[PDB]
Design a protein around this nucleic acid. Structure first.
Lengths: 117, 91, 178, 129, 103, 100, 232
RNA sequence: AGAACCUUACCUGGUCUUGACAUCCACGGAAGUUUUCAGAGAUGAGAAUGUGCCUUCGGGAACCGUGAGACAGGUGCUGCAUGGCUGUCGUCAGCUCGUGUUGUGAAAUGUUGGGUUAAGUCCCGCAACGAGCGCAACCCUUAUCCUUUGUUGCCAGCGGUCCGGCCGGGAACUCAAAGGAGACUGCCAGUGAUAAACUGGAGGAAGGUGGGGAUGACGUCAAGUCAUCAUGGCCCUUACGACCAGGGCUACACACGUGCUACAAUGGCGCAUACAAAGAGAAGCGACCUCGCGAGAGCAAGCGGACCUCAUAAAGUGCGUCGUAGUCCGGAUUGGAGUCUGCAACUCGACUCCAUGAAGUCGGAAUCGCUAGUAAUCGUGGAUCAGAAUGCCACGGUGAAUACGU
C-alpha cells in the first residue's frame, strides 16, 4: 500500500511498488522480490503487512533520501570554495551538463519578468 | 557524471611543464595555454596560470580539486544577471 | 469559393465487426490513432448496458444518440446595415458525429473505474433526458429554429432583389439578396 | 492454381496467401498451428471470422502464408485471402462475397512525403510579427 | 533451397541505364557461352538528399533530390570464368559497372 | 565563403600524415586499456606532444572545391547551393527528381 | 522575378544529363570532383572549335568521352596525335585507361551557348545593343529549334544603371520533364563591369534525349530459361 | 543538416611575410616512416630507417622551414554599379508573343461576360484573329491483375528434420523491377441553358479527369545573398593574407518561431505475446571471441548489403490493474559511476546506467496544417556524418472526423 514517494500504487504490481519507498528503484526491486521468494506478478495490496515489512527491511540498507540530500548539501558547499563554474551552475539548478538554458526555464532559472522581445 | 576517457592517463602536455616545477617547490604563476588538461598528484602545490583567450588567470592547484579539468576554477565566461540596458544619453 | 461539390469517401471496416453502426461508433471513439483498443471499448461498454437491461444491449445507446443530437444550425452574416443570422438544415452524418463526440468527451471526464462503466453510465444518463449534452442539443436547436426571421443585410436586399427579378416576401438567404 | 485454388489477399502492404481444399476443417498457418504463430492474440478470432460466415470452420481445410505489415494488417489480410480463394463451390461465390464486402479492398494507396514541410503534406505554421 | 553456382552484381545509377546495360551483358553471356541465367531485379537502392532551393531564406517548399542505384544478378548456370572476363570487358555502354567474383 | 578555413584544411592532410600516423592508437597503448599492466607511467607519458592539429577530429573538410561556411554534403564533395547549381547544368549523373 | 528552377528538378525521369556514370557509397565524391575537373580541363583543350554538348561516361574498366560539335572530326585533329593527347589527359585526371568518340547532337549547327556568344559581342564593344537580342533570336529560329527563350541582364549597353530584358518565341514549355533541352548561363566582364545571358533552347518534346525502354530486361536475350527452378 | 579548439564569422595570445596553394630563382632538411624530448602548440633539437624523383647532379619538384619580385590570397565596400540565383502573390485563373481593328491618342480588345474547369477545358457570344505559357500530356510510382526472371527470393505436395527454404528438391505461391494491362467523366441517371462537367449509379483491386507524385505563366516588389560563386569602379597585400593554441554562438532574465514528448486510462504499469518496410556500412561497419550493470571496448571471419550487421522495432495485442490524488501520468534538475572522435571532453559536444525527485491537470492574447496512407500517433533507418539527435528527410506499424456553406 502507498505510504511514501510519487509512483507507489494501490492494488498494482510489486515491480513498481518499491521504486519510491526511498533507496530502491527497479533494478534492486527485482532482486529484493526474488530474495523473499515473492513473485514479480503479485499486486502488493493483497499481502500481509509482514511481507511488506520484510521487503521494506531489504530497502532500508541502501541510501534513503535524508542522507542523499546531505551529500548534495556538502557537494555544493565543497564546490563553491573552488569556484568550479560547472558547480556554481549545479547550485542554482542551471542545466549545465549538455543542455540549453534560454528555453522554457521557470521552475529552475526563475519566473516571468519585464524585458523586451 | 563524466569519467575522463576509459583507462588511466595524466595529461602529457601539462606533465612535462609541471614535473620539473614540483621538484623546485615553485608556487609562481606557470604560463599555460594548454587548458585541455587534468589535475593529478604531480600537479598539487603548483599555481597554473590559465590562458582564457584574453589573458592567463592563476589557478592554485590543491588536493581538494581532483576530479576536474583545468580552466573551470577561473572564469570560463561571465553571467547574465537580472537588470541591465545600454540605452542612455550623455553630452 | 469551391469550383465543385465533393462528398464523403469510403471508410474501411475493422477486424472484429461487419456492422456499420458499430464501426462508425469505434471510429470517432478513436484517439492516439489506435482503433484496435477502441473495438474493445465499444464491445465492453455494450455488455455493461446489456447487464443493466437484458431486452437489449442497445437500450440506452439508441435514445442518448437521438436526444443529445441536433437537427438545425445557425451562421451569422452581415456585410452592412444591421446584424443578422441565417439558419441551415445540415446532414444526418454531422448530427450523429456532434452527438457521439459529445458522449465521449463527457464520459472520459466522468471519472469512473473503467472506460466501460463511464460510457454505459453516460448513455444511461442522456437516454433519460437528464445528461450533460441535453442542455447542448436544446440551446443549439433553439437558436437555429429562432433565427429564421432574418437574412443577410436585409434592408438593402429587400429593394435590390425586386429590381433584378425576385419575390416580395421575407425569406432567409445564403449571404445574398432576399 | 493447379493443385489448390488460391487467394492473394493483399491489403495494407500485407499479403495473405491462402491455398484452399476440402477437408476435416483444420487450419495450418506458416507450416504450423494458429497457437504457434498467433499465440495469445486477438488475431486468431479474426481469421475464423469469414469461415463462420460460409459455415466452413469444420469442412474447408486451408494452408496459409503471410508476410508484410503488422499484427492487425495480417489478420485483416487473411480475411480477404480466404474470400478471394473461395471460388470452387460456385464461380459466383468470390463475386458475391465481394458484393457483401470481404474482397472489397479499401481506397488507400502508397503516397510519398513532400519537402518544405514537417510531414507528408503538413506545412509549417506561422505566428510571426 | 537451390543456391547459385557463381556470384555476379551489375551496378548502375538510373532505370534506363540498368535495363540497356544488363540487356547487353546478357547478350555477351550467350555470345561467348552456352549456359545462361536470366537476371533477377534485386531491391534497388535510393539515396535521400535535401537541400535548399534558394541561396538564403525560405522554409516553405525547399528541395529533395533522388539517386537510385540499380542491382542486377545475371549470373550463369555454368561457373566458367572466361565468360565473366568477357562480360565485364565488353560492357562499355550507358555507364554501368558490373562487379565480378568467383563463388 | 572565406579562404582561411579552406587554407587550414589543405595544410592539414600532409600534417595528418606526419604527426598522427605514428601516434594513432599510441594514446590507447601507453595510457588506456591496451596499457594492461605495461606503461601507464610518467617516463613514457611525454611521447605524444606533436599531434593536435593532425588529428581526424579536426578534419572537417567543408566544400572540397571552393569552401563554404557549414552545410557540407559528404557524398558529392559539394554543398546545398553548389549541388543545385551543378544539377541545373546536368553535370551530376544518375540524378532524379523524386517521384514515386 | 520568381525564376523557377529551370532544369535541375527535371532530370533522370526520361531526361538525359551531361554525365552518365555509376559510383555509390562514400567514393561518389572522389569520382564527381574528378568528373568536374575533366569537364573543365578537357573542353578548354578542344576550345579551338566551338562545341555544342559535353557527355563524360564511366562504364566497367574504362572512361568514355562523348562530345558533340557543329562539324565532326574537328576536335579530333589531323594524323591521330591530337586525339591520343585528348586520351592522355582523360586518363590522367580520372585515373582509368581512356576512350573518346566523336558524335553530333540533333540540330548540330545550333546551340544554346553560341547564341549568347553572338549577343555578348555588341555589349563587350559598348555599341549596338537595342535590336541585337531580337536578331540573335531571328537567326537562331532560322538555324533550327521549335522555340527559344533569351533573357539578357547586365549594366546593359554600357549604361550607368542595370536592366532586365528578355525575348521569347514559339513553343518552350516550362513544367516539361521528358526529352533533353539545351541550356547555358553565360558570365563575362568588360570595361563597365559584368554582363550575362540565360539561354534556354527547346528542340523537341519527344525528339532528342533518350526514350523510355519498351521491355523488361528479364525475358530478353536468355538462351536458357532456367538454372533449375524445380523443373529438373 | 550534425559547431571542444577545428568550426568561423567572433575575440585574445604567439609567430611570419611569395605567404596554407600553383609557376618561376635562392638556401637547409628528402617527403615517407619509426622514436625520445623541450615549448602551449606553431615550431625545433636528437635518435634510428631511407637519400628515392628529374636533370649540366647547374639545379629543382614533393612536404617543411627560410627569402624576393612579378603574383597568389581577400565572410574588401557598394544588392540605386552589377552577374549568376531565388522568395512572394497562387495553382491567381489568369499572363504573354505576332498582327488587325476602334478612338486624335494615351491604350484597350483578346487577356472581359454567362455557364463549366486543373485547364485559353468545353456550350453560348460581342474585333479580336493566329500561337505559346500557366493547366492538360508524355514521366516515374501504386493499386489488383497479366507478364518474365528464379537469387543474395519463394515453398501446395515430397525428403534430411529439432519441421527453420538452412539444405536434397518443387514452381501452386507471394515475392523483388520492370513491360505494362485496367478507368475514358467513356457509359447510365440526376444536375447543368442545349452544353462542358460535377454527383450519384455499377462491376471490379480500384472509379471523380483511378490512387501518388511530378507539377506554378509575363512580372512589378529598388524584395534577399558581392558570404557558394562571378565581378568592375577600387582598398590592404609584414594585410580586409596566413600558421598555431585557448575561449564564445548553445550565456539566462525573459519574451518570441518551429518542432518534440507529457498532462492521461483510446493511455501507463506489471507479467505474457505479435508482425515491418526501407535504407546505410572499402581510412568503414561487422558474426564469433574475451571484456562489459548497459551503452560500448580492442581483436577478427565476413561484407558490398535481398547474402553479413545495425535489430529485442515499438506502439499494438493477451490478462489483470489504475481514479484526477502531480497518479497507477510525467519524469527535468542534482549527487555519482560507465562510455565515444581525439594528447585532450570543463565551460559548447554525444550516449549508457544507479538513487532521490520538482515543473507540467490540455495553457490567454495569438494561430496554422490537414480531403485520406491524409490527419493523428508509435518505432525504424537514412542524409548530415571526426564524435553524437529531440529535428528534418523518407519508411513501415495502428490509422480518424468531415467537406452543407462563402
Amino acid at each position: 500500500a502507498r505510504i511514501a514517494g510519487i509512483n507507489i500504487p494501490d492494488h498494482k504490481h510489486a515491480v513498481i511498488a518499491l521504486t519510491s519507498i526511498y533507496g530502491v528503484g527497479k533494478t534492486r526491486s527485482k532482486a529484493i522480490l526474488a530474495a523473499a521468494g515473492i513473485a514479480e506478478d503479485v499486486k502488493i495490496s493483497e499481502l500481509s503487512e509482514g511481507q511488506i515489512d520484510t521487503l521494506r527491511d531489504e530497502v532500508a540498507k541502501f541510501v534513503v533520501e535524508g542522507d542523499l540530500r546531505r551529500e548534495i548539501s556538502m557537494s555544493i558547499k565543497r564546490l563553491m570554495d573552488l569556484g568550479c563554474y560547472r558547480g556554481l551552475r549545479h547550485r542554482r539548478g542551471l542545466p549545465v551538463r549538455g543542455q540549453r538554458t534560454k528555453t522554457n526555464a521557470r521552475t529552475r532559472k526563475g519566473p516571468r519578468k519585464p524585458i523586451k522581445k | 557524471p563524466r569519467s575522463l576517457k576509459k583507462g588511466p592517463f595524466i595529461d602529457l602536455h601539462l606533465l612535462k611543464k609541471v614535473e620539473k616545477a614540483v621538484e623546485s617547490g615553485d608556487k609562481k604563476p606557470l604560463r599555460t595555454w594548454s587548458r585541455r588538461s587534468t589535475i593529478f598528484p604531480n600537479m598539487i602545490g603548483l599555481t597554473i596560470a590559465v590562458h582564457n583567450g584574453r589573458q592567463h588567470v592563476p589557478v592554485f592547484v590543491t588536493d581538494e580539486m581532483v576530479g576536474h579539468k583545468l580552466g573551470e576554477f577561473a572564469p570560463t565566461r561571465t553571467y547574465r544577471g537580472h537588470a541591465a540596458d545600454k540605452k542612455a544619453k550623455k553630452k | 469559393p469551391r469550383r465543385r461539390v465533393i462528398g464523403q469517401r469510403k471508410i474501411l471496416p475493422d477486424p472484429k465487426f461487419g456492422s456499420e453502426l458499430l464501426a462508425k461508433f469505434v471510429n470517432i471513439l478513436m484517439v492516439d490513432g489506435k482503433k484496435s483498443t477502441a473495438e474493445s471499448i465499444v464491445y465492453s461498454a455494450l455488455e455493461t448496458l446489456a447487464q443493466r437491461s437484458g431486452k437489449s444491449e442497445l437500450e440506452a445507446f439508441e435514445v442518448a444518440l437521438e436526444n443529445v443530437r441536433p437537427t438545425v444550425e445557425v451562421k451569422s452574416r452581415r456585410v452592412g446595415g444591421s446584424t443578422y443570422q441565417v439558419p441551415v438544415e445540415v446532414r444526418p452524418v454531422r448530427r450523429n458525429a456532434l452527438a457521439m463526440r459529445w458522449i465521449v468527451e463527457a464520459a472520459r471526464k466522468r471519472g469512473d473505474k473503467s472506460m466501460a462503466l463511464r460510457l454505459a453510465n453516460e448513455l444511461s444518463d442522456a437516454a433519460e433526458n437528464k445528461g450533460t449534452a441535453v442542455k447542448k442539443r436544446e440551446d443549439v436547436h433553439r437558436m437555429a429554429e429562432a433565427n429564421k426571421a432574418f437574412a443577410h443585410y436585409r434592408w438593402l436586399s429587400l429593394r435590390s432583389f425586386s429590381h433584378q427579378a425576385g419575390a416580395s416576401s421575407k425569406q432567409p438567404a445564403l449571404g445574398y439578396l432576399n | 492454381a493447379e493443385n489448390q485454388y488460391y487467394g492473394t489477399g493483399r491489403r495494407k502492404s500485407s499479403a495473405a496467401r491462402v491455398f484452399i481444399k476440402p477437408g476435416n476443417g483444420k487450419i495450418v498457418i506458416n507450416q504450423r498451428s494458429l497457437e504457434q504463430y498467433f499465440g495469445r492474440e486477438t488475431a486468431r478470432m479474426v481469421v475464423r471470422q469469414p469461415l463462420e460466415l460460409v459455415d466452413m470452420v469444420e469442412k474447408l481445410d486451408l494452408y496459409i502464408t503471410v508476410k508484410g505489415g503488422g499484427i492487425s494488417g495480417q489478420a485483416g489480410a487473411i480475411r480477404h485471402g480466404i474470400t478471394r480463394a473461395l471460388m470452387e463451390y460456385d464461380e459466383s461465390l468470390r463475386s458475391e462475397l465481394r458484393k457483401a464486402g470481404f474482397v472489397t479492398r479499401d481506397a488507400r494507396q502508397v503516397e510519398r512525403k513532400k519537402v518544405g514541410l514537417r510531414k507528408a503534406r503538413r506545412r509549417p505554421q506561422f505566428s510571426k510579427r | 533451397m537451390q543456391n547459385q553456382r557463381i556470384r555476379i552484381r551489375l551496378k548502375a545509377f538510373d532505370h534506363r541505364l540498368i535495363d540497356q546495360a544488363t540487356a547487353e551483358i546478357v547478350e555477351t553471356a550467350k555470345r561467348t557461352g552456352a549456359q545462361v541465367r536470366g537476371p533477377i531485379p534485386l531491391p534497388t537502392r535510393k539515396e535521400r538528399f535535401t537541400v535548399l532551393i534558394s541561396p538564403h531564406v525560405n522554409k516553405d517548399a525547399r528541395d529533395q533530390y533522388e539517386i537510385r542505384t540499380h542491382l542486377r544478378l545475371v549470373d550463369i548456370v555454368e561457373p566458367t570464368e572466361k565468360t565473366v572476363d568477357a562480360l565485364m570487358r565488353l560492357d562499355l555502354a550507358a555507364g554501368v559497372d558490373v562487379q565480378i567474383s568467383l563463388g | 565563403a572565406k579562404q582561411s578555413m579552406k587554407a587550414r584544411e589543405v595544410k592539414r592532410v600532409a600534417l595528418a600524415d606526419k604527426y598522427f600516423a605514428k601516434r594513432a592508437e599510441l594514446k590507447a597503448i601507453i595510457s588506456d586499456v591496451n596499457a594492461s599492466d605495461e606503461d601507464r607511467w610518467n617516463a613514457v607519458l611525454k611521447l605524444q606532444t606533436l599531434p593536435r592539429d593532425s588529428s581526424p577530429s579536426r578534419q572537417r573538410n567543408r566544400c572540397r572545391q571552393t569552401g563554404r561556411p557549414h552545410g557540407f554534403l559528404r557524398k558529392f564533395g559539394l554543398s546545398r547551393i553548389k549541388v543545385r547549381e551543378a544539377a541545373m547544368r546536368g553535370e551530376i549523373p544518375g540524378l532524379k527528381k523524386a517521384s514515386w | 522575378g520568381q525564376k523557377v528552377h529551370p532544369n535541375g528538378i527535371r532530370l533522370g525521369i526520361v531526361k538525359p544529363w551531361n554525365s552518365t556514370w555509376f559510383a555509390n557509397t562514400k567514393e561518389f565524391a572522389d569520382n564527381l570532383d574528378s568528373d568536374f575537373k575533366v569537364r573543365q580541363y578537357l573542353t578548354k583543350e578542344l576550345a579551338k572549335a566551338s562545341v555544342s554538348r559535353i557527355v563524360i561516361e564511366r562504364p566497367a574498366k574504362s572512361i568514355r568521352v562523348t562530345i558533340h560539335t557543329a562539324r565532326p572530326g574537328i576536335v579530333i585533329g589531323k594524323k591521330g596525335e591530337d586525339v591520343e593527347k585528348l586520351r592522355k589527359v582523360v586518363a590522367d585526371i580520372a585515373g582509368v585507361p581512356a576512350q573518346i568518340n566523336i558524335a553530333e547532337v540533333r540540330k548540330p549547327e545550333l546551340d544554346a551557348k553560341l547564341v549568347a556568344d553572338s549577343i555578348t559581342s555588341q555589349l563587350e564593344r559598348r555599341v549596338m545593343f537595342r535590336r541585337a537580342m531580337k536578331r540573335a533570336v531571328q537567326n537562331a529560329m532560322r538555324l533550327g529549334a521549335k522555340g527559344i527563350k533569351v533573357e539578357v541582364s547586365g549594366r546593359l549597353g554600357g549604361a550607368e544603371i542595370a536592366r532586365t530584358e528578355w525575348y521569347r518565341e514559339g513553343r518552350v514549355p516550362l513544367h516539361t520533364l521528358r526529352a533533353d533541352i539545351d541550356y547555358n548561363t553565360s558570365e563575362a566582364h568588360t570595361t563597365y563591369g559584368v554582363i550575362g545571358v540565360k539561354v534556354w533552347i527547346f528542340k523537341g518534346e519527344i525528339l532528342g534525349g533518350m526514350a523510355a525502354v519498351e521491355q523488361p530486361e528479364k525475358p530478353a536475350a536468355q538462351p536458357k530459361k532456367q538454372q533449375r527452378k524445380g523443373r529438373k
